[PDB]
């Protein structure tokens, strides 16, 4: 069958972007799908990115031109989209949602991108009790099978259990090196030698992860500064245009 997998890291970042969001939020899911014979398919979402829906419209019609301008080369990695709504504990697909999933699914589908049968819509909501002492976060992954959407299972890969266990052995998949694969090859490694390889990878990873913290901070400041400038400039000329 089918299965959506994701790490605690990636999931935590998505939830982070949702909660810090001023209003409701939309964005795209990045990752890759693999097939495993036993045929089952794992769709792993590696990362997310937020984008203003009002920056992709002409009406309810999506502007496929402005969409390409935004995603910009990273369209290949796109495997779905997500929509975050507030307070509404409702977790059902609206009409506008299905229309957006169809539009998005067709645009990123094809030989170059992902499979249309495997394009995901991720719905997320955030409610709160009257006292606001308890916060409820609900989410679900969906796909368009017949002609009726069905919820697809989600496995959050963790130390206790992960999608790879279906035996203890990691089954090989059928059929663009990431940054971690790059770091591995960087060590030029070649069993008791399996241990030495493991320890070296651990140290390399630790050191590499620590040099990213300062880079991540500077990127967050750059993008957060530009956001503020654009938001105010819009308001500036909006108040001007409203005067003349």
């Amino acid at each position: 069958d089918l299965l959506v997998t994701i790490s605690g890291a990636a999931l935590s970042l998505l939830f982070f972007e949702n909660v810090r969001s001023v209003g409701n939020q939309m964005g795209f899911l990045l990752g890759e799908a693999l097939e495993f014979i036993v045929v089952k398919i794992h769709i792993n979402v590696e990362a997310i990115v937020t984008c203003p829906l009002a920056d992709l419209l002409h009406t309810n019609h999506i502007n496929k031109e402005k969409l390409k301008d935004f995603v910009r080369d990273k369209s290949k990695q796109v495997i779905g989209w997500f929509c975050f709504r507030r307070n509404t504990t409702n977790l059902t697909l609206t009409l506008k949602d299905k229309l957006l999933h169809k539009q998005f699914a067709s645009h990123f589908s094809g030989v170059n991108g992902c499979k249309e049968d495997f394009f995901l819509t991720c719905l997320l909501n955030a409610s709160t009790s009257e006292t606001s002492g308890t916060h409820k976060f609900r989410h679900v992954f969906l796909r368009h099978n017949r002609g009726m959407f069905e919820p697809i299972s989600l496995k959050i890969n963790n130390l206790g259990d992960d999608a790879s266990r279906h035996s203890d052995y990691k089954p090989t998949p059928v059929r663009t090196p990431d940054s971690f694969t790059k770091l591995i090859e960087s060590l030029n490694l070649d069993r008791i030698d399996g241990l030495d390889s493991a320890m070296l990878i651990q140290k390399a990873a630790e050191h590499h992860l620590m040099s990213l913290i300062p880079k991540v901070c500077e990127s967050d400041l750059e993008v957060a500064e530009l956001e503020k400038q654009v938001h105010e400039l819009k308001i500036k000329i909006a108040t001007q245009q409203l005067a003349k």
Binding site: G8, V19, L154, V223
Partner: protein, 233 residues
């Protein structure tokens, strides 16, 4: 204690820690400042699984007070409920209780995770803010423009803790005289390390790097808009 203001970047650290394991409860301390009834939580400490733990958490708050030049102290605690309801267990209420005798306005946070439906296939994560029977305290997750330097480093510390837990165990059978045992222990240790790199460390590396990358995507997008708007002036 009237209400709690928990920063989004701290919230992310706690959630990430909760999602690290499905078969155990995870735990950590909260750091911040307490003013007029509300507790502003802006820092977090990931704990092993104490007296020596409290010390390192207390030391952190001291170092933050100097670096940020604002009063930082351990304001509360948090721990996860995998396959459980957010409702604080009897032990949750008792632990929270002893903390209050040491500190009124001491807040407890419970993160329920890994709760999916049979055929629904919908997930639910609850965040419960409580004190002590368990009384609910009003909570508001407050926006941050970024992930703090300290919150980023806290995420990476879980990776270090897990590896140190494994090195200490492997050390306690270092020079086993039996070759079979020796080969066994090394195989065990090798699987454990690669298990930490695959589940925790690598995903954290990939998340950091792709956030930086995707930030630049959005960034260049924003400046395209900033030029198009600047024309109107």
């Amino acid at each position: 204690l009237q209400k709690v203001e928990l920063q989004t970047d701290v919230y992310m650290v706690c959630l990430q820690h909760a999602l690290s394991t499905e078969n155990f409860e995870v735990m950590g301390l909260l750091i911040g400042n307490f003013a007029c009834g509300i507790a502003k939580i802006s820092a977090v400490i990931i704990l092993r699984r104490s007296s020596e733990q409290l010390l390192k958490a207390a030391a952190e708050a001291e170092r933050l007070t100097v670096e940020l030049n604002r009063p930082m102290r351990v304001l509360g605690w948090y721990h996860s409920h995998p396959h459980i309801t957010v409702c604080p267990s009897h032990v949750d209420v008792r632990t929270q209780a002893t903390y209050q005798t040491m500190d009124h306005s001491f807040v407890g946070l419970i993160f329920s995770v890994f709760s999916e439906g049979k055929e629904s296939k919908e997930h639910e994560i609850f965040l419960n803010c409580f004190q002590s029977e368990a009384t609910e305290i009003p909570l508001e997750i407050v926006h941050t423009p970024d992930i703090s330097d300290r919150c980023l480093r806290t995420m990476t510390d879980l990776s270090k803790i897990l590896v140190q837990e494994e090195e200490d165990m492997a050390e306690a059978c270092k020079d086993h005289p039996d070759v079979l045992a020796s080969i066994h222990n090394n195989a065990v240790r090798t699987r454990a390390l690669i298990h930490i790199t695959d589940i925790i460390t690598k995903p954290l590396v990939q998340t950091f790097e792709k956030r930086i990358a995707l930030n630049k995507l959005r960034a260049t997008h924003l400046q395209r808009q900033l030029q198009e708007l600047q024309k109107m002036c």
